Amino acid sequence: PPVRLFGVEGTYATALYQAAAKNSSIDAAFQSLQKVESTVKKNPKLGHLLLNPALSLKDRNSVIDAIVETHKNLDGYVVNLLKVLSENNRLGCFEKIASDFGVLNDAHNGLLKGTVTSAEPLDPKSFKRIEKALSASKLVGQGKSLKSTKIQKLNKVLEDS
Amino acid sequence: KAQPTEVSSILEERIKGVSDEANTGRVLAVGDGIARVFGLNNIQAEELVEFSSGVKGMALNLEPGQVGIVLFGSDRLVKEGELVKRTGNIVDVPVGPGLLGRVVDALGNPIDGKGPIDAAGRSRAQVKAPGILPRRSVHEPVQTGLKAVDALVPIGRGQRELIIGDRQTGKTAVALDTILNQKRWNNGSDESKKLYCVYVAVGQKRSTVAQLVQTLEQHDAMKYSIIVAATASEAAPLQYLAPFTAASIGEWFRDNGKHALIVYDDLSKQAVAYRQLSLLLRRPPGREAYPGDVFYLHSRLLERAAKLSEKEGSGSLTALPVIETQGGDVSAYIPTNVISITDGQIFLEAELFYKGIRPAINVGLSVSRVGSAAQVKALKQVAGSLKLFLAQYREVAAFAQSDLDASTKQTLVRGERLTQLLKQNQYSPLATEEQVPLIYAGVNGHLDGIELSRIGEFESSFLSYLKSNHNELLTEIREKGELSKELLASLKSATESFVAT
Amino acid sequence: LLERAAKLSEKEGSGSLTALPVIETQGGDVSAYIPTNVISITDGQIFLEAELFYKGIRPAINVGLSVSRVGSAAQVKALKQVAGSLKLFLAQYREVAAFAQF
Amino acid sequence: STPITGKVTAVIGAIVDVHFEQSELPAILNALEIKTPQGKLVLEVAQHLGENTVRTIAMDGTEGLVRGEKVLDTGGPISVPVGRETLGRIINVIGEPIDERGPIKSKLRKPIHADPPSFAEQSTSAEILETGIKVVDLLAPYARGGKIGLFGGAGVGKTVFIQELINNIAKAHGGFSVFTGVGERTREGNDLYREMKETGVINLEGESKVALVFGQMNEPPGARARVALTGLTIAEYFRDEEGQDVLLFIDNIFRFTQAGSEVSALLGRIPSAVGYQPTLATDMGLLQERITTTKKGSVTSVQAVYVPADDLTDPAPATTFAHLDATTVLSRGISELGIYPAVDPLDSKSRLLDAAVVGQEHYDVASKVQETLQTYKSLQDIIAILGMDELSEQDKLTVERARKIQRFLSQPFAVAEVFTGIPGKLVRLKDTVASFKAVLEGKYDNIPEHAFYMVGGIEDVVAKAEKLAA
Amino acid sequence: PITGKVTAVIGAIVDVHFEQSELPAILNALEIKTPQGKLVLEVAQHLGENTVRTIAMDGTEGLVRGEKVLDTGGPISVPVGRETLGRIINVIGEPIDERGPIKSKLRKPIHADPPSFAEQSTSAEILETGIKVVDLLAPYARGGKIGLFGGAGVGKTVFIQELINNIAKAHGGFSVFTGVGERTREGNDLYREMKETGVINLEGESKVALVFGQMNEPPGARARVALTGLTI
């Protein structure tokens, strides 16, 4: 897909997207990737045991296989993601692989970017011109607390003259 | 932090399947004569490999994910993703006498349009030097024909004498006259007395090599010489390899009870080549950007030269490495290493050269650690005085500018004549029995009478006269190799007769 | 930059641009990187020297080393006429003044 | 139309990375094109970085380049027009005209990278090419078919010398000639093009005897690094396919090495010594070895060699020596004496100075002249310290003769009239040897030193001797 | 028996992988078996992820990635004691004089601890050499270090042999001659000259053990030989 996403560190999630895009296997991969991060960050248990430069090749593979058999959504192609990072010493940056998977689904089936204040709506219609015009009018009236760009430009012009 | 091998293209292959190909390697990247390759997992260090396009290369860095192969040809031939095949082969070379009179590249290929080499076998480019045990002390002369060298800087068989000087001083000329002088024996019958020539040309203009060929053929020297050619324009690996490649060619003769001599022209340029490879492979640089093992490079090469012991067939390999100083700098990184490996140096200087003293041998700076032991006993007989006289002549030299006492006057009288006697036109090396008379008449003061310009025509006329009227004494020197108490009065008498006439 | 200085042809209006770059050395060394670069880029140099200065030659131009490669082409004819050979002569002068030290 | 497209992914100075679809990369040394607002921008593939990305070098300025911009594969190396159609034209690195005389209408173009002739294609000949220049023809005579370098630090007279050569050689020469301007002064080139017209060598409404290839220092490294091969290819074509005599003039070949230097690091190579690229030796080799007489025809080349910081042992020139049949070494010390050309009579060498090629007498004169000056050089210690007074009589004469000789080696060039106001004198090789012979045997000991300075043959020594004594 | 795998080969630098906390300490001897005999590798660094970086004691041509590597569980060790006299030994404690193995009673690591500040000599003291010049003008330290200067043509080896003899004869202590960066020619000379002078006695007893480490050997070898001998 034309998304770039770096080229060395960002290629971890893009590599498995090619095999997961067959027979409708992209939907189940979103909810399974979130369970790996959540049970390691806010668990204090398997984080300190895996981030160290000890263990072994066989010990890292057995720990991933035992966790995945009792957790939600890990019986398809999810087991293969953890194995690749165990042997190549890449288990320390698990948040980077899960973050770069979600950006693929939201770029080819939705909008992104921003506008002003907080976030925009991020519609999944078609073209960006017909989406942004119909969403700007509906989000300006509803909410919009406004808590300056025009004032700053006027002041600068008068001090330079 | 980051690494190579699996990246983007190579990283999107193991996610779908951990098999794909059951095998060979794949070029990850290529440039500057280097190609990085994935796989080839069973490859040996320094294994030759072959690319889809047909260019060969060798594997030098074996890294976790990738192999680092150096190219033998233009890397325009190589592309990313290309297939690479092991040849399961450490660089070797055909060796044996079917090579005599041939001009090969560094891999043993024929470059002279004369068909396939007939190899008595093959030897790896890299080989252990003969150890502490299977060597004898150097004891047979390499007679170069050059008066100055044979008389004052005697070379032994198995020795490693280094030829050194700035550019354009005469370095090749010294070597080439050694080669040209072997006809005396190589045309004869007696094996133990012949000497086969091996000229390793490194990063020379091909037209030069061509002409060096056209020069030995003009002296019928080709028939017993081998040119390994790694010309200016060829891949650095070939320039790196050529001397080891040729080294193993020499050892054939060494190992087989015969004798070769090997000229490395030059080691300066080999070191430059090694450098290119390393830097590109991004091996860490030291002094002048050479790798740590640049010494080890040259030690390995020159330690292979030797005089083997009786048990080993008593064969021998002699080494004439050429080293090119820059503005005379012997402290320069490479010259340091090499000078400290060799058994001495023949030292050239453009100063002496423009004076007209050719060969332009600095005598004061040239030594042969082997020395005495390697000299036609006869030449060593009438010349133990020669280094003595020319030493004292170097010390009273500046007195050449009105009121000098007869002692230091005399010293200047020998010196000029003696120095004159060691000038020698190119390509005309002298037979020993032709040197010893001239060096005799010199040292024992039979030229002091003669003027300094006539010392030219003196040599010519003396020798041709000695030939007609005293061919018998000349014959005894050539045959006995020593001088009788009678022979000394013979020569003395024949000289005093010619000097009077 | 320095190539941007040139003397245009008649077709192009005959306009010129003339450049006097300056370069500072250390310890008189002109063989250091940058000076070397520019030295060979320009149509000649004027070397100023501290030794000359303190003994009273000001401008402390070094005739020995200063050149204009255009030369007489850009001198005024009158100046040219009476300056015939001066620069060579001034060289011969340093020559005899070095031999004077004997 | 079967065109290959890529996109620009980086620009860092003169280095432009381009990205292409799956295993479909242009090979190393291929040209790429980018169609810009004014003209096109040529690239040259340098490495295959991997992941379908190539590192290129730009044959122009890289400002204005936008990442993600379409790149086009020409399918092969940079092309130049070749043959007789390049005669009288000025060409830039990328085989495009710069004389505004319309398009170079040749039948063939040719890749500027090509392989150097096999060992077995070589042709050795000891033939002698008379320059007209006294010191060369006497001491270090140039070889027809040879290669001939002119070493010199900045402003010692290389470009003037090389032009004096063109002034003489390039008329008497029956065949064709290429001149390559590699990183010199746009204005020098200007002069040449205006001289060629007036010497007649070029004729924009008729027959011309020379091709002009320019890539001056006003141009970025990539360009300055390939225009030698552009020129060199045009030569090659006359050598091999017009089967004939060429004269290849390169000024200045050191800028091929320098330009190599300026992008080396940006291509990610560790510097070698004196901060030169690791590939100095082989890169120079890979060019120089093409400039060569072969069985199909003969090239004869004159290459000016910049000697940086007047240091001859600088890796760059130090390497070039091995490549030349004849070396003319210009010296600041010489030139500072008002002795033009600035040739160092001792350090200059040419293989042809051998009795077998020039005869014994020539070789003997040439050797003695050298001994003379070598002695005179050796005695300059005793002259400074104890004057000229404290000398042997033979010595006093050797010095007298050496000084007379130093001067007879200078000579007014035609080209350099702007500098001497003295008319250009050309001397015949036999006249050179005879006059030096005479000088050497003392048959001229009475004539004052100044009579030998900036004159032609011994005629002119006598003429001046009297004209001054008047 | 601890075992690893070759993961990287770069000139005299080899990289070996291992299993969890089995990594040999730095300065350990690792062996790979070759068609000839054994290549020895000295450990320089634990790079992490169970990998050690080594420096070779010989060439590395022909090494294939993933090759067996045995840990000796120590530094390089040499034969020691009387059994080494008249023997030629190399950097890795091997006979190179083709007269069998040295049959020593022990073996000792070439890397060791300098005698603590306790075990120190409180007084400087002259070692008698028996040479007039020396003893009278430039007397030797006992347990001291003497810089010997001069190339050839000056009887260096004769003089060395004299001291080996005189230290043995007058005092009653042996000598160890170490050749660091040896020119092999001179190793063959020395060895012969020593036999000829009978400081080496193939039939009776020697006074000197010979430990050579010549030029042709790779940088690791040439660094350690001094210790190899010193240990002895």
Ligand SMILES: Nc1ncnc2c1ncn2[C@@H]1O[C@H](COP(=O)(O)OP(=O)(O)NP(=O)(O)O)[C@@H](O)[C@H]1O
């Ligand atoms: N004994 C001699 N008599 C006369 N001429 C000689 C002699 N030795 C060398 N020459 C000439 O001097 C020049 C230099 O000799 P040469 O063998 O090229 O030295 P070199 O170190 O190999 N120069 P190079 O290696 O090309 O930088 C050659 O052109 C020879 O023709």
Ligand SMILES: Nc1ncnc2c1ncn2[C@@H]1O[C@H](COP(=O)(O)OP(=O)(O)NP(=O)(O)O)[C@@H](O)[C@H]1O
């Ligand atoms: N034959 C000559 N007679 C008189 N002056 C000369 C002669 N040759 C050179 N010069 C002087 O030296 C200057 C430099 O000449 P030039 O040929 O441009 O040197 P150069 O070495 O080619 N400069 P560069 O190309 O940067 O190395 C000129 O401006 C002339 O004054």
Ligand SMILES: [Mg+2]
């Ligand atoms: Mg040579």
Ligand SMILES: [Mg+2]
């Ligand atoms: Mg110029």
